[PDB]
Design a protein around this ligand. Structure first.
Ligand code: ZN
Length: 149
């Protein structure tokens, strides 16, 4: 129940592109984890997966609370914590994670509304910290250049 202070600057386009350039590279990430559409702009931070304008729509219906959707080419006002969620997840990660439990469900309003799915989301939040906390904003990867102030 901690509101959370605000003493840091949001990630710029470049930085955001750097976090997506690494995830996109992957063949299982550059394809809508749902159908497999290549260059899946749409991305779901909740499950840190890649979706396509087609599928992404379904998620939006569920409710930003159930599955938040954010583009990569347009949406630039991303949150450090979020961005990571994508790196600390991946498509395959879920493709298996789910089965491991035994979802045996395809439906979007069900497969995602199932326990197996939930477990994932939470997990993403945790890991996201490992990367986020790391040198706070300073892109763990390397020193991009801290702006005076
Ligand atoms: Zn799709």
């Amino acid at each position: 129940g901690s509101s959370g202070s605000s003493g840091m600057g949001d990630p710029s386009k470049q930085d955001i592109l750097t976090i997506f350039k690494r995830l996109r590279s992957v063949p299982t990430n550059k394809v809508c984890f749902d159908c497999g559409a290549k260059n899946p702009s749409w991305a779901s931070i909740t499950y840190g997966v890649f979706l396509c304008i087609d599928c992404s729509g379904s998620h939006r219906s569920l409710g930003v609370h159930l599955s938040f959707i954010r583009s990569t080419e347009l949406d630039s006002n991303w949150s450090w914590f979020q961005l990571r969620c994508m790196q600390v997840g991946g498509n395959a990660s879920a493709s298996s994670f789910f089965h491991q439990h035994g979802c045996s469900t395809n439906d979007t309003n069900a497969k995602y509304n199932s326990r197996a799915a939930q477990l994932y989301r939470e997990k993403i939040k945790s890991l996201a910290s490992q990367a986020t906390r790391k040198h706070g904003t300073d892109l763990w990867l390397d020193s991009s250049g801290p702006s005076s102030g």
